[PDB]
Amino acid sequence: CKIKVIGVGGGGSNAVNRMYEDGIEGVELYAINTDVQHLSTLKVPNKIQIGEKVTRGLGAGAKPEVGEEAALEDIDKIKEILRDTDMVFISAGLGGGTGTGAAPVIAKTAKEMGILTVAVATLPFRFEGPRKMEKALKGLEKLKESSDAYIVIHNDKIKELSNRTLTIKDAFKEVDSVLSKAVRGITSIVVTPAVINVDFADVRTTLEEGGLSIIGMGEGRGDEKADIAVEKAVTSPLLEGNTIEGARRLLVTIWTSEDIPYDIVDEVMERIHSKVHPEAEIIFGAVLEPQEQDFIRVAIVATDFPEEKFQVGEKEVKFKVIK
Ligand SMILES: Nc1nc2c(nc(N3CCOCC3)n2[C@@H]2O[C@H](COP(=O)(O)OP(=O)(O)OP(=O)(O)O)[C@@H](O)[C@H]2O)c(=O)[nH]1
Ligand SMILES: [Mg+2]
C-alpha cells in the first residue's frame, strides 16, 4: 500500500518532522512550504517549495489567498508527488497562510486522482488570538470540500489533557506528539507487520467520504486496562461538540505492550461497541508499543457523523453546505 504524509506550512511540516523522529515506517514523508528557511531546518526526507513567484521563498505572510496561489502556481509539483499513491495524509496547522491556503488545493488534487485523502488539521490555541481562529475556520470550510475525511484537532483540547508547559515551544511539542500518534496509529496497522493488521481496503471503506472526523485516545494499565482505556478514549475527544458515540464509522487502533496478548482486543471491542452507536461500522487493528509494559492505548478515529458540526470554546461551528 502506498501511503504518503504531506506537511503543509510550518506547523504541518513540524508534525511530519515529529512523525519521522518517532520512527514512522513504511510511509513516504514530505514537507511543503512557501518559507524556504523553515524547510531547510527539517529532517523530513522530502522537502518541496511552492510559491517561488508569489512569495520569493519568504512565506505567505499569514494570507491564505497567497498560500492558495502558491499551490496553484506549482500544481505540477504537487501532482508529481501524488503519483503512485493509495492514501495521503495532509497535515496542516490552520490559521496561517500556507497550510490554510494550500492544503485545500493539495487535497482536491489528490482526491481527483482517486487517492484516499485524509486531512489532519489543527485549530489554534486560545493564546494565538481570535483572528487566527477565524482564518482557520474559514480555511477548514474549503479543506472539507476537498477531502474524504478531515480530522480536526483543537490545540486547546490537547493543552487541557496534558501537563502544563512553560514555553510555547513545549506546548507545540505536545501537539506534534499527539498528531504523530494519531497518524502512526493508522499507518502502522496497514503498512507494517502489526499485531492485528487491517487491509487498506477497510481503511478506505471506513474513511472514504467520511467528512468531519474526531479522535479520542486513552491509556490503560494493570488489571482493568481495557475498561480504563476505552472509557478515557471515548470521553476525551480532541474536538468538542459531537460525541464519538454518535459516529457511524470508526477506525480503532489498540497499541499493546509486548507482554499483552492479542486477545485483549476482544474485551476492548466489546467495550467500544457497548459505548458507541449500535449501528456503527468499526474496523480495528493492534500494534506494539515499544518500551511499554502492562499497557494499552486505545485510539479512536470517529467519522461519518449525522451532522458536520462542532464547538470551539463558546462558538458552535457549522458550515454552509455539506456535500
Ligand atoms: N503541529 C504544530 N503546529 C504548530 C507549530 N507551531 C505553530 N505555530 C506557528 C505559528 O507561530 C506559533 C507556532 N503551529 C500551529 O500552526 C498554525 C499555523 O501556523 P504556521 O503553520 O506557522 O503558518 P504557515 O502555514 O506556515 O503560514 P505562513 O506562510 O507562515 O503564513 C498556528 O496557528 C499554530 O497553531 C508546531 O511546531 N507544530
Ligand atoms: Mg510559515
From Swiss-Prot:
SMART domains from the UniProt entry: Tubulin, Tubulin_C
GO cellular component, one term: cell division site
Compartment annotation: Cytoplasm
GO BP annotation list: cell division; division septum assembly; FtsZ-dependent cytokinesis; protein polymerization
Keyword GTP-binding belongs to the record: yes
An example Gene Ontology molecular-function term: GTPase activity
CDD domains assigned: FtsZ_type1
PROSITE patterns named among the record's database cross-references: FTSZ_1, FTSZ_2
Keywords, comma-separated and alphabetical: Cell cycle, Cell division, Cytoplasm, GTP-binding, Nucleotide-binding, Septation
Binding site for GTP: 10-14, 97-99, 128, 132, 176
SUPFAM superfamilies associated with the record: Tubulin C-terminal domain-like, Tubulin nucleotide-binding domain-like
A Pfam family reported for this protein in Swiss-Prot or TrEMBL: FtsZ_C
N-terminal signal peptide: none
Predominant location category: cytoplasm
Entry similarity comment: Belongs to the FtsZ family.
Assembly information from the UniProt record: Homodimer. Polymerizes to form a dynamic ring structure in a strictly GTP-dependent manner. Interacts directly with several other division proteins.
Function of the molecule: Essential cell division protein that forms a contractile ring structure (Z ring) at the future cell division site. The regulation of the ring assembly controls the timing and the location of cell division. One of the functions of the FtsZ ring is to recruit other cell division proteins to the septum to produce a new cell wall between the dividing cells. Binds GTP and shows GTPase activity.
Name of the featured protein: Cell division protein FtsZ
